[PDB]
Amino acid sequence: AQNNQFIYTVATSLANLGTLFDLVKGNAGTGLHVLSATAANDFVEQCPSEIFAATNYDEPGASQNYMYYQFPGRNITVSDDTVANTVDKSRGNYIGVTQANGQQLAFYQRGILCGGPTDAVDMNVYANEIWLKSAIAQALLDLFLNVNAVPASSTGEAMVLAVLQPVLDKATANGTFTYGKEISAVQQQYITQVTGDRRAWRQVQTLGYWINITFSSYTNNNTGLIEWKANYTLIYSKGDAIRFVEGSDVMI
Amino acid sequence: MFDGELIAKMVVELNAAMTSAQEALQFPDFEVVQKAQPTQQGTSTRPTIFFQKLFDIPRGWPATDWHLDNTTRKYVEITRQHVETTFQISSLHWQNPEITHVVTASDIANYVRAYFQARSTIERVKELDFLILRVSQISNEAFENDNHQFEFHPSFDMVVTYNQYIRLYENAAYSADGVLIGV
Amino acid sequence: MFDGELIAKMVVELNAAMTSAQEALQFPDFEVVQKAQPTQQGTSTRPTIFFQKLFDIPRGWPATDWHLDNTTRKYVEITRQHVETTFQISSLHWQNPEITHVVTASDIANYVRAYFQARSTIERVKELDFLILRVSQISNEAFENDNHQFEFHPSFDMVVTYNQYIRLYENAAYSADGVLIGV
Amino acid sequence: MINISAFGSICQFTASRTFPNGFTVTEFADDADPIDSPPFTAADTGVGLNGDMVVWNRANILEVVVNVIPNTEGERNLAVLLDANRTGKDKSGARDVVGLVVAMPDGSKITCTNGTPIDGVLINAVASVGRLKTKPYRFRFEKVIKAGTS
Amino acid sequence: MINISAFGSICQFTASRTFPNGFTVTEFADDADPIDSPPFTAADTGVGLNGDMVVWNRANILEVVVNVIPNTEGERNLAVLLDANRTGKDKSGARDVVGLVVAMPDGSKITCTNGTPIDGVLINAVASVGRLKTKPYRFRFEKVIKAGTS
Amino acid sequence: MINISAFGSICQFTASRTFPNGFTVTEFADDADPIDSPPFTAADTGVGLNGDMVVWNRANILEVVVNVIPNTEGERNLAVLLDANRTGKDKSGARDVVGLVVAMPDGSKITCTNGTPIDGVLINAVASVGRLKTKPYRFRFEKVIKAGTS
C-alpha cells in the first residue's frame, strides 16, 4: 500500500514457497528467497540488501540486473535442475549453482520480486524506481525548505519542474532510463489516456520520459481552507537486460 | 494609482525650480499650475509654469514577485510595471518693452529644463522615487493673447520613469505527490 | 459568432477590474459601458470605464479539420480562424479640486491596464477562452465636458486573441478505383 | 487553446553550483524579442553523381536568446550567474549546468538542460536618450523537452 | 484556371517511420511566405579559351520552406517529426523518408518524395508584443513530380 | 530603485602614468550611444558524435565604447590619454593602465580596471552642416567589478 520507498524481504525455507506465494503473490514488490534448510550461516535476504547499498546512483553505470552476482561465503540452497525450476514459478531467489567446462560458479539466479499485474516485477527496475522517488522527494524538500510554497498557477509548475529536472538528468545519465524503446499500441493508448497529450507517447519513444505537473485542490482533516498541492506525473521508460543466450552453431 | 503622488512631487520640484529661477534672473512672483484646469479659472499675469500629462508608456513586461503573507497561506503576487510618463512643461510670461531687465518665457523654460537635467536634481529626484530622461527640444511658438498682443508659449516634453505596483492573490501549496508509472 | 460572447466576458472582466480598483484607491461607485451606445443614453457622473471595438485582424491562414458525423457520411469541415480583435478601453472621471483623495482618470485606466497585464488575470482570461496582448501606450488627452470645464479621457488599445469556428459540409469517400495503364 | 499569445510567460533557471533551486525571470524586453532561438540544423544533405541524396543526421545543440530589462532582480541574478560562469583573471569560474523552463501562458512548458551561458553584455549600456539598453543573454542547451498541451 | 491565387492550399505529409498515412498542414503563416523554395541549379557552365561553352548538368536536390502559425496541430505534427529525425544526446533519431504533397486550389498538385527535415526552431520564440513568431521548417527532397493542370 | 533611466552617469577615469587621480567625463553624445559594450563571450560549445555537448570557458576581456561631445574638457583629457598611449614616429608612448568607473544615477557603480585605449579619431571630424562629429573611444579592460545595488 505504501508502494513507494521500499523493497521488503521474506525469509522462508523450502516447501513453504507454494503457500507463501499464494498469500503474497502481487502486493507490489517483495523479495522471497529460499533458505538453505541445512544451516543459516548465510543471511540470505542480504543479497538484495547489499547490492542496493552499493549502486551509488550518481556516477554513470548504475543498474546491475540483480541476477548474475557472485556472493561469497553463502550456501547453495538449490543444486538440482528440477528443484531450481520448481522453486521458480513461485518467485524465489535460490542462489544456485552450475558448471561450465569445469569450475562451479555461484550466481544469485533470478531477480523477479513478486508483482505481476503492472508492478516493476524486477529488483533492478523496482530499485531504480525507489531511488527515483527518493531523489525527487529530496529535491522537492530542498525546494520547499529554500522558499516555502510555490505559486500554484503556471509558475509553480515552473519551479517544481525546474527543480525536478536535474534528477531526471541524473536518471538519464545513470542507466535507469533508456534512450530508445518502441512504445506500441497498448503502451501508446495507455500513455495517451493517463494524463499526457496525444503526442506524448512519441517523447517516451525517443527521449525516455514525459514529466508534467498540475495542481489540485484538496481539503485536509482539520484545514477548512481548501489547500492546493502539486501533482507531477513522470513516465518511466523501464529498460531491458538480457539474461539468456541461444546459439545455433552450424556446419560443426 | 501613482499619477497623483507624481503630480504632487512634480509640483514640489517645479516650485523649487521657480524658487531657484527667482534667484538667477528675476521675475515678479511665480505660479505653477496644471494646464487642464478642472474648473473655469483664468490665466495669471505673473510668470507661470504649466504642466500636463500627455502619454503613458509602459517599459518592458511586468515583473511579478511573489510574497507569502504567512497568515492565510496566500501568495500576494506583486506585478510591478515600469512606466515612462510624459509631461508637457510650458511657460508663459508677457514681455514688457518698457522694462530693461527683460527675461522672456524662453529663459524660464530653458532654466527649468537645465535645472531638471542637472545631476544634483537628478539624485534628489531619485531619492524622491523616480527619475528624469533627456529633453531634446524646446519649441518657442507665438500666439495672440487676450489683449491682442503677441506672446510666446515655449514648451518641452519631460520623460519621468517610475514603477506602479499591483497586488493580487494566488494560491499556495506545500506538498507534492507523484505517479511513477512505467511505460 | 464571437462578438457577443466576448463582449459579455470582457464586461465581466472589466467589472471585476473595477471591483478590484475600488479596493486600492477609492471611487464613488463605477460603471462599465460600451462607448457606441445603440440608444440615446447620457454619460454618467460616476467614474466610468468605456470600451469599444476598433479592428479585427485575422492571424494566419484558416485551419481546417475534417470531422466525420458518422450518420450521413458527411465530412463536416471545421474552419477555425484565429482573430486578434482590438478594444479601445477608456475611462472618464471628473476631478474635484476640493477633495483631497484625488484619483484621476489616468489612475483608473492605468490600473485597468496593469490588472489586465498581470499573470493571474492572464491565466483566468485563458480559462475564459481568450488571451491578452501587450498594451504599449496610454494616452491622457484633454477636452471640454458639458459643463465648460476641463476633463481627461485616457484610453488604450488592448489586443484580445481568440478563435472562431466555421462548420460546413463536404462529401466523403471510402473507395480507390485506379486505372493502371502501361506507358 | 491554440492561441498565439505568450503574454504570461516565465523563465525558471537552475544552476547546479550557482543557483540551486533558482530564480524567476519575468521582466522581458519590449523592443527586442523576449525569447528567441536560432534555427536548428538537425540534418545535412549531399547529392551524389546520379542523384542519390545522402542524408547525415548531425548531432547539434539548441540555442536560446533571452532579452531582459537591465538592473532588475531576475536580470541581476542572470548577470550573477554569467559572472560566476565567465573566466577572467584572478577569478575562479564555476563550470555548472543550467536548466531553463519556459511556461508559456497557454499551458505548454519547454524545458532545456545541460547548458551554459554563451554571452552577455556585462556592463549596463546606456542608449542615446538615457534609457538603459535591453540586455541579451544566450545559452546553448544540450537537451530539450516539451511537456503539457493547452 | 490560369489564376494567380493560392488560398486553399494544403500540405499532406507522409513519414515512413513517424507518420505513416500522415497529416495535413493548412495553417500557414501570414507575414512570412507559406511555401518557399530556393532557386534550383540544374546546370552550370564554364567558358573555354576560344569561346566553347561547356555545360555540366549537376545533379541537385530541391528545397522547401514551410512557415506555420506557432503552436498548431499540423505544426505540432511537424515538430514531432523533426524531433524524431533530429539527433542529440541520449535520444534515438529515426532515419525516415518524408513526402510532401501540395494541392493548391487551382487544381495542380506538386508531390515531393524521398526527403528529410533540414531545420527547425524547436522552441516557440516570442516576438516583442507577445505574439509567437512564425515557425519555419525546411526540407530537402530528392524527387519532385507535378500532376494535374487546372 | 529599479528604473530604466541613466541620466546623471559619470565616467571617472584613472591612468597610472598619464592621469593619476584622473578626470571625469559627463558630456556624453546625444545621437550615438554614450556607453556601449560588445557582447561578452565567456564560453564556447561544441558537439560530439553521439550528442555530448562540450564546453570551454574561454578567457576573455570586456570592451567599452564611450561617445563624447567634440572639443570638451573630458574628451580633451581622453585624447591626451590616447595620444600618450598611442605609438607613432619620434614620439614616446607611455604604456599605462587605465580604470573606468561608471556611477549610474540609480546608485550602482561598475568599475573596470587593467585596461588600455583601443581606438580613437585624433581629428575633430566635421559633419555636413558644420556640427563636429561625436568622438567615440574604445577601451578593453581586464577586470570588471559591480558594486552597489539601489
Automatic annotation (TrEMBL), chain A:
UniProt superkingdom: Viruses
The species this protein was found in: Pseudomonas virus Pa193
The protein, known as: Tail sheath protein
Parent sequence residues shown: 253 to 504 of 504
TrEMBL record, chains B, C:
Protein name per its UniProtKB record: Phage protein
Record Pfam families: E217_gp29
Organism: Pseudomonas virus Pa193
Automatic annotation (TrEMBL), chains D, E, F:
Classification lineage: Viruses, Duplodnaviria, Heunggongvirae, Uroviricota, Caudoviricetes
Name of this chain's protein: Tail fiber protein
Origin: domain of life: Viruses
Species name: Pseudomonas virus Pa193
InterPro entries on file: Gp32-like
